[PDB]
Amino acid sequence: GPQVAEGENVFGVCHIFASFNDTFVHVTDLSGKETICRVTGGMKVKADRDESSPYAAMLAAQDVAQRCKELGITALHIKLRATGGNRTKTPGPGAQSALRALARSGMKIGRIEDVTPIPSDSTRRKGGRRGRRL
Template identity: 50%
Template sequence: MNKAIVNIFASHNNIIILATDITGSETIVRVTGGMITKAQHKEGGPYTAMKAAEQVVDALRNKGVSSIVIKVRASGGIKPKNPGPGAEAAITSLTRGGLNILEIENVTPMPHDSCRRKKRYRSKEKK
């Protein structure tokens, strides 16, 4: 096995990195932000994402993987469509680990006129 798919789900609160074989059926390794840090407000940060990606690189090296396809995903739908702050740090760490990146793809779900968004909060003015 020399190719793998690395799925990065990066929200503003957490990061999940999942590495599978090229078919996507067999999971090689899965690392989340909560497995790296115990402080809940740091789970989605760049440092946590970098450490999680380093663990993924080690596991992929042990399996003999040399090249990867990266799929980045944000929350999407009616939620934010931009990946969190950890996505870029994770991709950089995967590159520094010596893995050959074949493709980087954005797989964030985009709505085609979906559910109505929640109304904005308007604070009450004091008189």
């Protein structure tokens, strides 16, 4: 699409939101406003168990890469994101599999960074005082 020289790599920004219920691999332009393509574990597997599975993440990142090839984007800036807020800060199990799958598809790796929403003195967490008893 873009009229650019074969040598020069056209960059994009890939937001990877890796929760414990699902994984989000979402490619956009340098700004973030104009999105390119988003695919989540739900679209790949039809099992609420495996929405967040590394396999689902791998498939999602493989399909979004396959689509990005056809729009002229060769390189991606990775932004890894855990649920954050008052919830867990560690990324979900899909993150690494998704990143591997993007790197394997032939898409170039730009600046890697964590964009987890860290909170300074947040509001009461969803669990009670005694917490979750399971």
